[PDB]
């Protein structure tokens, strides 16, 4: 039978996979970058950032 | 410079080997025709199979040609069957001219003496069978195994197979007397009997222990103590103390006895052997006998796997302890 020795299910998932990223990273401004710098400094207080 | 006694005192010729009659007859007939078959010697070790094949090769060939025309190899190689097959091919391919001044020319086929013939897998043995059929005419072999049963069937169908039953204790007692009188060492006959009974019918191990004992003592009297601890044989009152501790009802004296055995240097394997030898010939119940003996078997496996002697002996003594104290 179908799926007797494996996972052959009659139903198949469509649309869950093939999620293309197409990610466009906006260049960070001064303020958000400095906030991230202070987050790094608070994570590692012994580092000369 | 000197040689060990085992090859120094092995018989030169067939007919000089004792206790075997049909074997001597068929080997002598094959020597008369100068066409020795492919041999398959099976029997307990030390029975003289290597001595018989060396004597046969010494009779057929010349003593200077004997070592030239024999190649002694073993077959449990850790590098596989391809290495020893390549050595066999090298030895058979390499041919040296040989003649005898006694008036009889040598047969063209050489001799490769391959021991431990019961120790290989079926695939390696089939590879050796292909090597056999490669050199059927130009070399005839002699395979020596402890048990003929492990031989796969194509080899056993083309080899003359010979049983070598162990020798009755009187004849190798006489032989060890011959060794002692020819090697000028002072031994009591009780010492020779004890050496026989710890040799367990192995003449080769007996004469090895004899030469080793006479070189330990340096000409002194070979006592029962030196032959007790040259074979690793445990003193029997130690076994009796182990059984008394198991009968006693205390685990503290049990572990004390085991500590006494281990700090004495006595190995666990020999202790298992003699414990088994006592248990098999006792008045103990077959239920207890069975439980103790299967415990002994798995303890033998455990110690062969690298486990501690002490732990396996404690667990073994605990099982024998519980089996004895259940009825009590």
């Amino acid at each position: 039978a179908l799926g007797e020795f494996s996972t052959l299910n009659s139903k198949l998932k469509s649309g869950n996979s093939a999620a293309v990223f197409m990610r466009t990273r906006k260049e960070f401004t001064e303020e958000v970058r400095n906030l991230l710098l202070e987050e790094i400094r608070w994570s590692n207080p012994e580092f000369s950032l | 410079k000197p040689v060990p006694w085992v090859e120094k005192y092995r018989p030169k010729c067939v007919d000089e080997v004792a206790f075997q009659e049909e074997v001597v007859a068929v080997l002598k007939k094959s020597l008369e025709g100068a066409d020795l078959p492919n041999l398959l010697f099976y029997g307990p070790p030390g029975t003289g199979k290597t001595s018989t094949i060396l004597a046969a090769a010494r009779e057929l060939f010349g003593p200077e040609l004997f070592r030239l025309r024999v190649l002694e190899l073993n077959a449990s190689d850790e590098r596989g069957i391809q290495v020893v097959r390549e050595k066999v091919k090298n030895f058979a391919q390499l041919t040296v001219s040989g003649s005898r001044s006694d008036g009889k020319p040598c047969p063209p086929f050489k001799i490769v003496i391959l021991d431990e013939a019961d120790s290989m897998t079926s695939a390696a043995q089939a590879a050796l069978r292909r090597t056999m059929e490669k050199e059927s005419k130009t070399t005839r072999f002699c395979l020596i195994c402890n048990y003929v049963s492990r031989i796969i069937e194509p080899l056993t169908s083309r080899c003359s197979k010979f049983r070598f039953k162990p020798l009755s204790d009187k004849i190798q007692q006489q032989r060890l007397l011959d060794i002692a009188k020819k090697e000028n060492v002072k031994i009591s006959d009780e010492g020779i009997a004890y050496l026989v009974k710890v040799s367990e019918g192995d003449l080769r191990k007996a004469i090895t222990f004899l030469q080793s004992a006479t070189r330990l003592t340096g000409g002194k009297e070979i006592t029962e103590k030196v032959i007790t601890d040259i074979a690793g044989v445990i003193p029997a009152e130690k076994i009796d103390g182990v059984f008394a501790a198991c009968q006693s009802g205390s685990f503290d004296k049990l572990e004390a006895v085991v500590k006494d055995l281990i700090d004495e240097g006595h190995a666990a394997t020999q202790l298992v052997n003699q414990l088994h030898d006592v248990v098999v010939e006792n008045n103990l119940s077959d239920k207890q006998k069975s439980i103790i003996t299967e415990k002994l078997a798995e303890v033998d496996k455990c110690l062969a796997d690298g486990a501690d002697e002490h732990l396996q002996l404690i667990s073994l003594c605990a099982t024998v302890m519980q089996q004895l104290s259940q009825n009590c």
């Binding site: 799926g3 996972t7 299910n9 869950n16 996979s17 960070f28 | -």
Partner: protein, 49 residues
């Protein structure tokens, strides 16, 4: 900006096994009954072994 946690399981190739919605420890914590989920857990252990 949004954080981008998850390079660790991507390094071990675990994103080739699980759904992008699925998390590693989240899949570990719940009860495994589905045959497909259990084959993915088998493939996970097969990758680490």
């Amino acid at each position: 900006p949004k954080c981008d946690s998850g390079c660790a399981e991507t390094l071990f190739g675990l994103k080739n096994i699980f759904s992008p919605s699925e998390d590693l420890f989240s899949f570990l914590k719940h009860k495994i009954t589905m045959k497909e989920e259990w084959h993915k857990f088998i493939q996970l252990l097969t990758e680490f072994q």
